């Protein structure tokens with residue numbers, strides 16, 4: 001078992017739900033991990049601290065190339081520690097501030113990795129509920145690493161549902177989430193990769209929420225036609241009519257959409273990602 005003294009702790013990578021993720025270097029190996037630290041003082045019923053109880057065991061057991069993984073755990077008198085994948089290259093959409101919108105080859109590749117990751121997650125009955133560019137990190141090899149900050153939920157077999165710019169209308173109109181809520185988020189992400197901006201934009205959050213529920217958005221003139229078609233098929237108010245959803249025959253029709261022509265879905269993790277720039 002590892003212990004706190006085996007690492008040199010660096011900067012904070014992220015924080016939420018009484019959990020702080022810190023960059024750490026393993027002294028013996030020079031390997032870097034993102035170690036999540038929870039103070040035992042905060043583990044009380046009223047706080048609903050994630051990853052302490054059994055309801056997230058299926059998430060903790062994931063061993064997929066596109067999700068940050070749990071490698072080890074340990075504890076001391078005051079804290080719980082969870083060693084997670086470190087995604088060296090940070091947030092995927094961070095390149096937009098320099099480079100602007102992604103080209104079709106790069107959009108197709110990164111969209112395929114996200115779709116492949118969501119298919120796997122949904123196949124385990126897990127819904128993310130807060131999928132956004134901030135949660136799509138990139139490792140040293142430039143492959144995606146999707147993070148959860150305690151929003152993901154395992155659905156029960158008895159229900160296909162569970163209780164701003166990337167939020168689906170059902171999370172706004174009926175305060176519920178389903179697998180299809182994540183496909184709405186995917187539609188927003190694809191649009192942002194291509195356009196360089198998210199689809200629902202307005203003067204403030206209140207107005208953005210109105211645009212979402214009314215489907216008030218437009219495409220710029222330069223939007224790749226196959227990507228436009230795909231986005232229109234994901235950004236549908238009725239959650240049962242989104243491409244990829246259970247009621248629309250699942251992932252096959254989504255992975256077979258013309259936007260994904262030439263994609264080799266089985267080896268995306270082994271392919272060299274296309275460079276965003278030389």
Ligand SMILES: O=C(N[C@@H](COc1ccc2[nH]c(=O)[nH]c2c1)c1ccccc1)c1cccn(Cc2ccc(F)c(F)c2)c1=O
Pocket residue numbers: 013014015016017019020021034036050051059060062067068069070082084085086087088121126127128137146147148149150152153
């Ligand atoms: O513990 C897990 N995730 C952490 C966040 O992990 C981070 C955050 C930033 C980082 N930067 C970097 O380089 N590595 C980083 C790791 C968490 C924080 C706060 C509350 C709850 C969880 C965590 C534990 C186990 C598995 N996963 C992957 C996962 C689970 C369910 C999903 F639906 C999903 F899409 C992905 C986790 O995110």
